[PDB]
Amino acid sequence: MGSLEQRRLEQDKRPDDVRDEYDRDEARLIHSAAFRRLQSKTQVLYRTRLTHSMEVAQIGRGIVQYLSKNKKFAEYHEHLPNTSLITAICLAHDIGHPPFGHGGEVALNYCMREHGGFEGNGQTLRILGKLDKYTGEHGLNPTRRMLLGILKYPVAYSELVNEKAYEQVPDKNAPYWLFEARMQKPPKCYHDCDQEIVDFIFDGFAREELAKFTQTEQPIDKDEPEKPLHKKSLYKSLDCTIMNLADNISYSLHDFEDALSLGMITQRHWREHFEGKEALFNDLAKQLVRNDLNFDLITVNLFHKESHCRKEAIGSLVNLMITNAIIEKNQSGCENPLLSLEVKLAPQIEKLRQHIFDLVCEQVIFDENVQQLEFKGQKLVIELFQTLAKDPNRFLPKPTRERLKKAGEGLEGEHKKSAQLRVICDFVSGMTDDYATKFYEKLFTPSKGSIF
Amino acid sequence: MGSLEQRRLEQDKRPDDVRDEYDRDEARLIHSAAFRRLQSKTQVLYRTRLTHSMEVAQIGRGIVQYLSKNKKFAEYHEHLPNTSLITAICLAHDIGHPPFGHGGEVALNYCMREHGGFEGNGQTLRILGKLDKYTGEHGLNPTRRMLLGILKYPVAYSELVNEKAYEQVPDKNAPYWLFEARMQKPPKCYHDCDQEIVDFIFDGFAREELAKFTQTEQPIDKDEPEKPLHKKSLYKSLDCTIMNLADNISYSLHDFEDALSLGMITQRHWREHFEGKEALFNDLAKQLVRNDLNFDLITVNLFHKESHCRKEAIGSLVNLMITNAIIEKNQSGCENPLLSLEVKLAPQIEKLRQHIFDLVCEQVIFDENVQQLEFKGQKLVIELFQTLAKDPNRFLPKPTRERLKKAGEGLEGEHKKSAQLRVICDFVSGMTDDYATKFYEKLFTPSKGSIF
Ligand SMILES: [Mg+2]
Ligand SMILES: [Mg+2]
């Protein structure tokens, strides 16, 4: 089998470069157009995706550091990623996310219904492995282990999608962009047209390991037992578990901290969301003997006037989760360490992390005004994709027109159409929020737009 | 003397934390309000200060890595900073820069003429050591070595300023914000009101070392020999030399790369700026035997249609400077390694780096439209500072009103005034470009502004 430091394309380093291949991955990523676009992309609307990706990289390094010295896990030290690989994986995890976030993701998936759908994490793999113009046709040409580390869902769209969930009540009067977004969310997956990339990631493993590692589950009873739902992938690589843990800690605490600052989560919300289960903080305070973890003391410090009393509690909770990162084996039958080993929190810490994250989804993610803005990004992307798809040679830039022509060669009929719509999907998804707004305004908004 | 890992305020780590003090500095910085503000701050206007600071951190780590293995410099390996310290120093170097960049810096220095002036690098030290609300009154409370690493100019404003350079031809008809900005630029320095911070940084050194390390020079003949000019500090710490080298590589190549993309630097500009001295590339190509360094070959790749041919040359030039980082001793009489040792490029590489950077200043920094926008930031900040200074209790937020009251206590007369204007200067300088624009529009622009 192939090495983990192997790339799809041959790009050997000069003898002047003792940097390991994982550092070369970090260097290419930071100097890449896909990573620099994280500035003009916000996840909530304040906090940009670049800042979130840096905080996630910091948390992941702290996780890897904590594990690399805890001798209870000394048996697994050799399989931990290094500082450069965990950073590059953490800094790349939100690269594929489209403009306007979930509003744009639902939009592109709805437009690509007959052509493979769209999902952000799949586009992250698509950009990293092919789209980014660091190479001709191999993206940034990352190492096998880095590609595996960003593959959060190693199962294809077709193998996971349940198109019965897309079913809608007919409405002759509704425009094409007007629908319930929750019923058009894609499965978390990789795109079928990128199977070659996934083949490379998995050529360094035994095929029985691949079958066990790509196992899925059928979730049941989201509201009713017969409600149709997509299938979920079940397992991620070891490095991916570390990044996914850091990614959730930031969403649970750092987006919570921003919610306190903006006033979207009050102490009344806190004490009502924790009206029961004050032991989520208190019982932990007893076991670890940390008076700072007392529910009433940490509540006063979180909702304190002095900003140094809040950041001290946020950082205390950030440190509490990093110090409670355990590494177990997943219920996959895999014997490879990178496929069988998982990093996660202590069960009592995860209960507290989730319960803080649930208050964030309730007051921030599902705020009426936040959702109204997501729908507008849905309308904008749909209306932009339609127009770019109706006459792509009139509107698209010349290099994008070349890819669309190139994608259709050797293909005819419906396969040619899906391959060319994929290029348009990669063009729109690779837009920044302001670039997509300007592109919308040049095409539709009455008095806006300039030829330069 | 005191240790380099010592902080002004006592904030010892728990036994659960094996992170070194320099990693704790990196962790606090990333989760700090001052570092997160780098998203909404651009240096040129595209590339944000956050992205520039990440690229600088990457270059610095590559420099430290290259030096930590080159055995010609093995005698100095023990004095190199670690990965966390060089990152925190690189990620913090542009924290103090005000809104609208040099336009805002000239603005604040002009307003603070009688009250100590303003300079960005000084505010970086002021934020890191006192202003940031991570602690009560000690900022992020960084280690002594990190504070030293961001102290680019270890000489005070008063000791360097030449107020004859501020002299202006009288103009009764000109508004207060209308002046030549070049004649009101401050010296590169630290603010006199922050001498206590600088005292702490230097208590870990012998006083003779401090006198030699804080030596200055009087530059002569900017245009004419008798043209008045500020004095310059002469020496930086070892870690600061590494950060300052990375900071200049990014400005010389990464801002050059953006200039190619936006069309602000043409191949005609390149071949005319290099009409002579093609040997800046070619002679290096002969010594290192690198055909890619041929002037005509690298020109075709830099100004190529394929974006992978440009990024390959930019990264080749980024790698060429990192591989030519030498560490010598400065002409300071210092015997401490952190004060006597400097990191810099090979003389022939610096000639090429500077000559590329000169084309960036000519076509980008001094573009007429870029300068027109800088002046507008100058007008906006001046008009905002004046109004905030005329009635600070009517306009400033309550916490900022508390600091201004607190800064004036124990003082009367002109010293009280300068101390309270310093708080207003810290408030404006700590604004983001959009926050300062909204604050300007609430106060002056006819139909804009909301009470929320
Ligand atoms: Mg994320
Ligand atoms: Mg800089």
Numbering used by the authors:
A (entry chain A), B (entry chain A): 1 to 45, 53 to 459
Quoted passage from the original study:
pmcDeoxynucleoside triphosphohydrolase (dNTPase) enzymes are effector proteins in animal and bacterial cells that hydrolyze dNTP nucleotides and inhibit viral replication. We therefore named the dNTPase-NTase anti-phage defense system Clover and designated the dNTPase protein as Clover protein A (CloA) and the accessory NTase protein as Clover protein B (CloB). Likewise, CloA exhibits strict dGTP substrate specificity, with the activated enzyme only hydrolyzing dGTP and leaving other dNTPs including dTTP unaffected. Together these results demonstrate that CloA is a dGTPase effector that senses phage infection by specifically responding to elevated dTTP concentrations associated with viral replication. Clover defense encodes an accessory enzyme CloB that synthesizes an additional nucleotide signal p3diT that suppresses CloA activation and protects uninfected cells from aberrant nucleotide depletion. p3diT binds to CloA in an allosteric site adjacent to the dTTP binding pocket and raises the threshold of intracellular dNTP levels required to trigger full Clover immune activation.
